[PDB]
Design a protein around this nucleic acid. Structure first.
Lengths: 125, 192, 95, 141, 213, 68, 140
RNA sequence: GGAGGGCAAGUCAUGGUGCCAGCAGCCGCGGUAAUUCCAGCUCCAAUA
RNA sequence: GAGGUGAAAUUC
RNA sequence: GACGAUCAGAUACCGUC
RNA sequence: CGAGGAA
RNA sequence: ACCA
RNA sequence: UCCCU
RNA sequence: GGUGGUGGUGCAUGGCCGUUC
RNA sequence: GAACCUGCGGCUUAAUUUGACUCAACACGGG
RNA sequence: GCACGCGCGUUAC
RNA sequence: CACCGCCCGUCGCUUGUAGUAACGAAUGGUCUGGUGAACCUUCUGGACUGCGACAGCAAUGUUGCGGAAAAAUAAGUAAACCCUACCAUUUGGAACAACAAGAAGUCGUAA
RNA sequence: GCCCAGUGCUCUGAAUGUCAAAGUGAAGAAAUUCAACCAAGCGCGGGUAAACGGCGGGAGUAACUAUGACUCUCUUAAGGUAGCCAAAUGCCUCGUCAUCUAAUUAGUGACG
RNA sequence: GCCAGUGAAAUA
RNA sequence: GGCUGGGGCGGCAC
RNA sequence: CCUAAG
RNA sequence: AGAACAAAAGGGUAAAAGC
RNA sequence: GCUUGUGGCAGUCAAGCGUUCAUAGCGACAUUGCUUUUUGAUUCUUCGAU
RNA sequence: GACCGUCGUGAGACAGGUUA
RNA sequence: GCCCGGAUAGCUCAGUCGGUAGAGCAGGGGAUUGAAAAUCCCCGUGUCCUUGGUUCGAUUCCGAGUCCGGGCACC
RNA sequence: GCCCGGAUAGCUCAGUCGGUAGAGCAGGGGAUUGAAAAUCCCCGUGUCCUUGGUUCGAUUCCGAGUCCGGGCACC
RNA sequence: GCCCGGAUAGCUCAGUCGGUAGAGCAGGGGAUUGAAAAUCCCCGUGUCCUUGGUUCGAUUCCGAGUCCGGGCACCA
């Protein structure tokens, strides 16, 4: 018997609301931390929008055979958007692309926070 | 008219009976009779200026000596004033005529010079000078105050007060100061 | 092996009979020298040379003497009565 | 006067003295004691021999190198000889058991500063001067 | 000094006087000693007369008390008081335990103390002159006060004290000094070793001294 | 070693010799030429302390022409 | 009062004489006092009786104490003047007085004592006998 | 038969080799820029 | 207490 | 040679015989 | 962490 | 540099 | 001040 | 066959700087 | 000695640029 | 980059 | 390349070397005691043969004389061989051992 | 050569502990039974082996390799010294290498 | 003296 | 002393 | 071996 | 009934023979 | 003197060797035996002669 | 009978070595 | 001739109550030096001697042969 | 084959009475040195051989065994 | 089997003719120190083996007990 943060649906209506213009409607704004709000309210890029749609096609076209088409990106600076949940995006770190299944919890958080950029240390001598 | 110390302590209330300390102390001079122990003087310049320092200025100096906590005479002049009030409220004597005695007593008259030859640590009999004697006396007195004064609600103006008193008495059980004063001579009387 | 000093071991004497707490020590030894008939005659050799007597004495012991329990009432007024516990080594009341 | 005696009648003395004090010379003491005849060549200038095997020897002190050498068996003498094969490829011509002609290196005694216990040079293979085998246009078998 | 001179304290000392002939009225002699000088507690006495034979000579108020019932244990006679509300404040110490146990004779009371007698009541009084002795304390302090009043014998307890007697005026010698000894028993000797345990003493009658040792 | 025999020579690139342009006179002639190239009066003429090395002409085409 | 033993003769103008022998080694020091015939010993104090450490069995200090210790004992013998015979294991040893030498005398003079004649009796030999060590002696 | 010195003659910015191959009468050359190795060139010496 | 050492130690 | 000591080691430089 | 060892 |  | 460096 | 090179030799070197001071 | 800071070594790492090593390396290459 | 080993320091009992 | 300099020995290791004395053998030479070919000489010996006289004129025959081969003989020169001693010149020999040289082997530190 | 602890021997020695007979004291009414002191001896101290006799054992421990003058050790007086051998002492042993033989469980020369 | 008595324990 | 695959040395089922 | 391991 | 009943081993013993 | 473990000696079965083949020549395992110059048990005969 | 080693205080004792 | 024993890389050498194969030196690639020794990381290289058995598998646990390697051999 | 003796930290060896376990050496980290030694401070270490049994508790006390050692086997 | 001595701090041991428990060393804390010693101050713990009686009390005095140490004498 488990639920999710603020209602995965309220947000799909919150984000794609009457004015589903800028990827992050001023609605989602009220939800994010100052740092994130800063960025969006400041100057977010458009590329971040065509990447958006790339996940879109991956989420539907794929049959319920739960086999999503990994979307590849270097946009580690992207802050997961509500509609970005469910898809598996391959994020570059330094060597290759990392495939991560987007859960409801990783929203408002930087897409980079999952693409481990370095292998911490094991030891011996 | 006569400028009393801290406004309430006649200087002429004391005299140096022993000839030793007569020139190695300050109570005696006209210039020494100060209201405040702060002179920002220029002692420590020639090689004996220290003498002309109003005995208590010296006490205050030797008193603000622990690192971080110290380096600010402003306050120290206080810790010494309160301590004088407190010494008075107990023996009601001219607290200079107390501190003074203490200075004369707490100064070791004998020390041992470490003279080692090829590993062996030998010592000899040495008679301690006057200037050195006073210096040691004060250094010692104060040295102790901090000893107890640490994690204690007892205050320096109190610790110090309680010290200057017994230091005058020669009370070998109540003066970290005179303890060494005796031991240094004793051990020294052994090495001699 | 833990005996208990005095314990009502019925007994008698008599001029008493019934029970009676008895302070019970174990038995000791006793010198003889120059009284014993054993001596009165066993003083010999016969006599410009000697030896001893057929039983004297190197045999082979047992490594376990015996408790000479010596129970003795005080009301019965008499008489220090001996008993015989056999098993060594051991000692009086512990316990 | 000095040690030597200056008498016209004492010639004999001086004479015997010189004949005596003269043994102190090695060059003298050397040839005088038929020493030359006892060496491996028996006085000789050169000696023929059969290659017992090509061995290599290490240079001494400040030098480090593999010297080419052949162990030879002298004919009438019949001794084991240590013989240094000269120039570059030289040892590549000396086949084991061939006939070789050997001579000494600078006064019979100390070997060239570099070599260790070698006292001889190899000049002929199957009776063919080495130099000849060393220069193409000359000879080879 | 347990020597021939005993009859010099007795025979030769039995008509000394200090005037003329020898008077015309009755006599009064004895033989001085003690009780045991122990400490009036642990061990110093038991039972058995000499005699001896006497009683008071002057007063007899001794010691007997404990509870509200110990007063009547000193009413039809005369003794000292231990009090009730004092054994928890002041019924013993020095001049206190004394009071009740410090008279002349000794003590003839009963017992009742508990955890208090190693330095107070029962304690501080022993060699002083009392510390719980044998006075058949069960029916009272009168019948056994035959060992605390008259007859006697010579109950010798507390601090020294005892008695003696044999004849009247003049008719004793070897049995005069040997009457003084006879005037001594469980006070001159007793059980395991007791033929002597002192240093000296005194004696006479009324004349003058006895043994000049 | 052993098989390491003549490692050097085997490794050396055989360069050829400049096929004599003309000839080298052998006889009083050679000794003559030498006499001329060095002890001829024009060289004993200039200082005997400042005359060149009989081989400074190490075969240097650049200094070869500068002299002649 | 006191029962002195010096002969029955006083007089603040009558000198008493005691011959004080003093041997000063580089290890130990001795101080002796005796009749002017030296056949009856009176006072005998050595540095050893004066300190704990075997190295100090010489010392200037040990000489003071052993010295002053004798003077006290001497006023009781009723003797005030002392003849000094100073030595130092002459034999075949450093014929030089030790250290506790000038120290001992000094102490006797200070603590009162009158000083008679003074001799040096370190036994110098005519010949000698193979000394301490040999050939090369104490090395290091 | 040589061209560092002794011992007459290269100050070639030559190619190969890299303490290896080898030189060297004795000093000493050689361990990646060798004046002594291998070889080219040019030189020197005695010259049938 | 000697003796002995820088100190001591077996030694007396 | 026997011993003390000194040394990381001392049958050595000191010391007792 | 309660004033800090050899340095 | 050590001495204080 | 020349011990230590 | 050049440009350019935070690529290699500080023991190939200038220049500069540290140390002996 | 303590916790942080910063440099050097080490060990990791795709990679952890490299110089420097007794004062005459290590908050020094203005790092 | 961290099991750790060094060296300036910052803050403090 | 300058005391973090030089440097010594034990043992070990690496690369090597066969000396002096003795003995063995080879060649040559000498001594000792014997065996002794051959030949000069010697005393023999006398086939064969020359002469003279006698048996016949002759072949032949007897004897006297002379030369004379083989054989045999003694003393001698003395080859070779053997034995007994000694000299000279060469050459030989081994595991372990030994010697030689070298080093930032190993342990210490002598100088 | 080194061992005096062991067993023996042997010296004035040890400030002290045993140690018999007579002799002494104490106690009983004595018989008798308790006492204290008490020669030697003992035990304590020293010397003593051309006196009896003795004379160890395991760990580590580089400059292929095995190796011990090295040190570590636990240890009883001392821990086999010169010298000397398969020897008339050596177990395995017919020891291993030579040497003498056609051939050697013999000889001899070596080596520990 | 003792009924008073303290102290480490009272005597003529 | 004894018991003992005969006695013995050994072991104790003395 | 058990004063209780009677 | 695998525990416990001093102690060897076996018997025995459960409202007990154990606690 | 028994007995024969242990010794020695033969024997059956045939998996194996024997390069191709079990037996020419040998044979693991397993199993039946003979032997009384080993040795071991045993104590019968003989210390009141071997 | 007599050496030695080795065990034993001794007497002797060695399936040790040596000789008549 | 019977009684134990080792067989393992280029040569000398260890293995839970099997299941995996190792240092050392040779050795080539480095780090290091001025270059080199020394030293420190790395490479590599094999039925762990041939047979038969035991097991899921044996280099190892078994059984025999095998080579070289210490202890036993008229009277 | 019989009778003995051990085993404890990485090594050489102490200790216990049934409760605890140690030392020296090694070693790890700093300090002195220009750098190594030496030396100076700091530090960590134990199935007390495996094994069942007793006991409330075993390195320790019994019973069995493995290993490494030494000692007998005579007539 | 008798006859002497002891039992004390962790160690080795003093110790009223009944009133206190003390050395020396170890151990520890500190100054000093190239290293280690030696130095130099300051501490740490006690049924005084156990059980009773003498005494106001007792390490002490006496009896008894256990233990260890000494000694001396026999042993069929």
């Amino acid at each position: 018997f488990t639920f999710r943060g603020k209602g995965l649906e309220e947000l799909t209506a919150l984000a794609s609301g009457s004015n589903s213009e800028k990827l992050i409607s001023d609605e989602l704004a009220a939800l994010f931390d100052a740092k994130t709000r800063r960025r969006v309210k400041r100057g977010i890029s458009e590329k971040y929008a065509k990447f958006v749609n790339k996940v879109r096609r991956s989420k539907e076209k794929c049959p319920a055979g739960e086999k999503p088409v990994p979307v590849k990106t270097h946009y580690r600076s992207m802050i997961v958007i509500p509609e970005l949940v469910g898809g598996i995006v391959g994020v570059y770190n330094g060597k290759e692309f990392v495939n991560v299944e987007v859960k409801f919890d990783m929203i408002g958080k930087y897409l980079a926070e999952f693409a481990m950029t370095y292998k911490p240390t094991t030891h011996g001598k | 008219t006569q400028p009393k110390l801290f406004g309430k302590w006649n200087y002429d209330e004391v005299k140096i009976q022993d000839p030793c300390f007569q020139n190695y102390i300050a109570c005696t001079t006209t210039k020494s009779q100060v209201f405040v122990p702060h002179t920002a003087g220029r002692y420590q310049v020639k090689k004996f200026r220290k003498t002309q320092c109003p005995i208590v200025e010296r006490l205050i100096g030797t008193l603000m000596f622990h690192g971080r906590n110290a380096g600010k005479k402003a306050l120290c002049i206080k810790v010494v004033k309160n301590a004088f009030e407190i010494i008075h409220l107990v023996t009601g004597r001219n607290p200079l005529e107390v501190f003074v005695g203490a200075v004369q007593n707490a100064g070791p008259r004998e020390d041992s010079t470490r003279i080692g030859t090829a590993g062996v640590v030998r010592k000899q009999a040495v008679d301690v000078a006057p200037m050195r004697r006073v210096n040691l006396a004060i250094y010692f007195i104060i040295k102790g105050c901090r000893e107890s004064a640490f994690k204690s609600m007892r205050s320096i103006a109190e610790t110090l007060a309680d010290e200057i008193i017994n230091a005058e008495k020669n009370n070998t059980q109540s003066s970290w100061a005179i303890r060494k004063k005796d031991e240094i001579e004793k051990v020294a009387k052994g090495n001699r | 092996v833990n005996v208990p000093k005095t314990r009502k071991t019925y007994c008698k004497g008599k001029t008493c009979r019934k029970h009676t707490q008895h302070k019970v020590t174990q038995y000791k030894a006793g010198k003889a020298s120059l009284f014993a008939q054993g001596k009165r005659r066993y003083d010999r050799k016969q006599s410009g040379f000697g030896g001893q007597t057929k039983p004297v004495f190197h045999k082979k012991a047992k490594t376990t003497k015996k408790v000479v329990l010596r129970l003795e009432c005080v009301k019965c007024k008499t008489r220090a009565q001996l008993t015989l516990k056999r098993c060594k080594h051991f000692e009086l009341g512990g316990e | 006067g000095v040690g030597k005696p200056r008498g016209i009648r004492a010639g004999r003395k001086l004479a015997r003295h010189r004949k005596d004090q003269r043994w102190a010379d090695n060059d003298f003491n050397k040839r005088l004691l038929g020493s030359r005849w006892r060496n491996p060549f028996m006085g000789a200038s050169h000696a023929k021999g059969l290659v017992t095997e090509k061995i290599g020897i290490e240079s001494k002190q400040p030098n480090s190198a593999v010297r080419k050498c052949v162990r030879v068996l002298l004919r009438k003498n019949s001794k084991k000889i240590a013989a240094f094969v000269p120039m570059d490829g030289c040892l590549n011509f000396l086949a084991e058991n061939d006939e070789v002609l050997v001579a000494g290196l600078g006064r019979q005694g100390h070997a060239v500063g570099d070599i260790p216990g070698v006292r001889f040079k190899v000049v002929c293979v199957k009776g063919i001067s080495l130099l000849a085998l060393f220069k193409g246009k000359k000879e080879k078998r | 000094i347990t020597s021939s001179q005993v009859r010099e304290h007795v025979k030769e000392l039995l008509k000394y006087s200090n005037e003329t002939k020898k008077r015309n009225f009755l006599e009064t002699v004895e033989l001085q000693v003690g009780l045991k000088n122990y400490d009036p507690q642990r061990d110093k006495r038991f039972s058995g007369s000499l005699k001896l034979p006497n009683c008071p000579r002057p007063n007899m108020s001794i010691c007997i008390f404990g509870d509200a019932f110990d007063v009547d244990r000193a009413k039809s006679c005369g003794v000292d008081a231990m009090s009730v509300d004092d054994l928890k404040k002041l019924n013993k110490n020095k001049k206190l335990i004394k009071k009740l146990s410090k008279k002349y004779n000794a003590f003839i009371a009963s017992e009742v103390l508990i955890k208090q007698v190693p330095r107070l009541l029962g304690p501080q009084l022993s060699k002083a002159g009392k510390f719980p002795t044998p006075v058949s304390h069960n029916d009272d302090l009168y019948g056994k006060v035959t060992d605390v009043r008259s007859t006697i014998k010579f109950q010798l307890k507390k601090v020294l004290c005892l008695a003696v007697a044999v004849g009247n005026v003049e008719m004793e010698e070897d049995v005069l000094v040997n009457q003084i000894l006879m005037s001594v028993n469980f006070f001159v000797s007793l059980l395991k070793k007791n033929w002597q345990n002192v240093g000296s003493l005194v004696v006479k009658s009324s004349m003058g001294p006895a043994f000049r040792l | 070693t052993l098989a390491k025999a003549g490692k050097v020579r085997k490794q050396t690139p055989k360069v050829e010799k400049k096929d004599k342009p003309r000839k080298t006179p052998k006889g009083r002639s050679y000794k003559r030429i030498l006499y001329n190239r060095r002890y001829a009066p024009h060289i004993l003429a200039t200082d005997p302390k400042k005359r060149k090395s009989p081989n400074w002409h190490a075969g240097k085409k650049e200094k070869m022409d500068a002299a002649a | 009062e006191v029962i002195s033993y010096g002969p029955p003769n006083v007089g603040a103008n009558e000198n008493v004489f005691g011959v004080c022998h003093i041997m000063a080694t580089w290890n130990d020091t001795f101080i002796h006092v005796t009749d002017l015939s030296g056949r009856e010993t009176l006072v005998r104090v050595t540095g050893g009786m004066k300190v704990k450490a075997d190295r100090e069995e010489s010392s200037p200090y040990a000489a003071m104490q052993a010295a002053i210790d004798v003077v006290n004992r001497c006023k009781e013998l009723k003797i005030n003047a002392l003849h000094i015979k100073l030595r130092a294991k002459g034999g075949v040893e450093t014929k030089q007085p030790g250290p506790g030498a000038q120290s001992a005398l000094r102490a006797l003079a200070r603590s009162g004592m009158k000083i008679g004649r003074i001799e040096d009796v370190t036994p110098i030999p005519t010949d000698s006998t193979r000394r301490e060590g040999g050939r090369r002696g104490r090395r290091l």
